[PDB]
Amino acid sequence: NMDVIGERIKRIKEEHNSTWHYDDENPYKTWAYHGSYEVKMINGVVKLLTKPWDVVPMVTQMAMKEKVDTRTPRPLPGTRKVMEITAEWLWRTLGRNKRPRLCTREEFTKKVRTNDSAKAAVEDEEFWKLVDRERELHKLGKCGSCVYNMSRAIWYMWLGVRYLEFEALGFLNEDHWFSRENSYSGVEGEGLHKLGYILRDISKIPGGAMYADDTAGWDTRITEDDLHNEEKIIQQMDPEHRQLANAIFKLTYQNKVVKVQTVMDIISRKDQRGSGQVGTYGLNTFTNMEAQLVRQMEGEGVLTKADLENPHLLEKKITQWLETKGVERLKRMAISGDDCVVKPIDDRFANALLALNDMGKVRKDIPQWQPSKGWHDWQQVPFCSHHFHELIMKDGRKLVVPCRPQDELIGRARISQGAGWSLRETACLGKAYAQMWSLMYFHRRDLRLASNAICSAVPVHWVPTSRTTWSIHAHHQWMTTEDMLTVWNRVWIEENPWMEDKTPVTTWENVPYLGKREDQWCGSLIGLTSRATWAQNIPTAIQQVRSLIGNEEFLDYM
Ligand SMILES: COc1ccc(CC(=O)O)cc1-c1cccs1
Ligand SMILES: [Zn+2]
């Protein structure tokens, strides 16, 4: 307990003698409690151009620790042996061609400069001086400020912990360990436009249905056993690298100190997965791959209830299954953190729930022992929040595109993050959403129309600033003043590995829409008179926005 986290706790309490009290009214049943201390907008452009969505409930809803505080039952001994053998095989497989390595101050500095306000932090040598400090400490087996939360110098300590984590484990993302080519099941770096093609390729594999089971609170279900298995990547590092990485796992993952928000609370726990940590996506992806392989093994009859309870379980059958079929089984899945799609060899997988429940990965909103429902159409499978619709262009070429309920897209676009933002900043974020819709959601009639209206409304030279999403699947091709059709051709034709015919598309007229029935099923307002009124009266609203923005140069895209 205290040896590992004590120093971290002492600095906060000593620094906060101004108000350090122990509350006996603290609601912490699972996390350890140490003490606490006292502490202290709609996007108008988009809203004006989407009047019909002013009513829609999902749009209004978006404008406006209960699960974290639980314990996960320890997995059984046989399960623990199976997870261990599987983790060792997977880590060796992921490391077959790549070697782990330390990440550097330069790499981290360059990432920050192109992604706030830590830019000022990385430009000051004082920041790097303290980092050299937890590092000497993180190297002797201790950390003193390496803590996380759920114009004060405390910010430097937080950013410092993140850099130290990046230095030790950033190579998983920086060297693409979870790319599809390296990991087989991974989709890191593919991007949203490619996920649909990946599911369609998965559907070609012979087998049973496609399963996409959601886990309830995945981060809260990461056990002490999962963390031990995740740490096995350490055996592949160089001694200098092994020392720092071991420090990150032992002192910040296997032990943690957190701050929650009026007053602030200091709590600690030896399990669960940290919120903002750098290795979270990669470690979650690795653990999900291991669990899904284990579920496939149970599905094939390789693992039984007796095997899960057996403390003296023999490795040979697991090693043989992994060695002869493990890569093929990995190839049947698309896994991004807690999102997974699995196409097992047959439908026995639907009822293979002993190991999955035993590892703590309990499926959300379904009785624990009810069989999973699979899909026979890859187009109905949900993954990373999306539908993947397959489309035929007028020229006969086929595209695979992503659908999501239209109210979710319009609702997000209508929200600006942060107050005190000028119209120019607001118009630019609107342009970013509009251009994102042109690139990814061009097949929705309402979004293409709203997209044309926003771009007509804002000055053509203006550069979209601010991100429309934090998703790891977003490549931000829409953050540009380059012609969107040129970008569309580059993304969907030129750089598209699934498009053999490279003939460019010269007009938006040749860029297809979803079928009218499907567009309506996915939330389109097309066919309602209110939509027709909006479409007819859109130029008037565009002129209204242009007049408020001022005398700048605009283009008509209707
Ligand atoms: C898997 O891709 C996503 C998942 C979720 C979301 C919603 C959000 O994060 O704001 C957006 C996306 C993307 C939109 C455009 C390129 S990625
Ligand atoms: Zn530390």
Author numbering: 272 to 311, 319 to 342, 355 to 405, 419 to 453, 470 to 580, 587 to 883
The authors write:
Furthermore, we obtained RdRp3 in complex with the fragment PC-79-SH52 using our novel screen under both soaking and co-crystallization conditions. We have obtained nearly identical complex structures using both co-crystallisation of RdRp3 with PC-79-SH52 or soaking native RdRp3 at high concentrations of the fragment. The structures attain the same closed conformation with loops from motif G (∼405–420) and motif F (∼450–470) missing in all the structures originating from the screen. All our crystal structures contain two zinc binding pockets represented as blue spheres in the finger and thumb subdomains, respectively, which have a tetrahedral coordination geometry as previously described. A significant proportion of the binding is driven by hydrophobic interactions mediated by the thiophene and phenyl ring systems. The sulphur atom of PC-79-SH52 interacts with the side chains of Ala799, Ser796 and Leu511. The thiophene ring points towards the predominantly hydrophobic portion of the inhibitor-binding pocket formed by His711, Met761, Met765, His798 and Trp803. The phenyl moiety also has hydrophobic interactions with Arg729 and Cys709. The carboxyl group forms key hydrogen bonding interactions mediated by water molecules with main chains atoms of Thr794 and Trp795.
DENV NS5 (∼900 aa) is comprised of a methyltransferase (MTase) domain (∼250 aa) at the N-terminus, mainly responsible for RNA cap formation during viral replication, and an RNA-dependent RNA polymerase (RdRp) domain at the C-terminus (∼600 aa). It functions by replicating the viral genomic +RNA into uncapped –RNA, leading to the formation of a double-stranded RNA intermediate, and then using the –RNA template to synthesize new +RNA copies of the viral genome. The overall structure of the RdRp domain consists of three main subdomains known as the ‘fingers’, ‘palm’ and ‘thumb’. Being essential for viral replication and with no equivalent in host cells, DENV RdRp represents an attractive target for drug development.
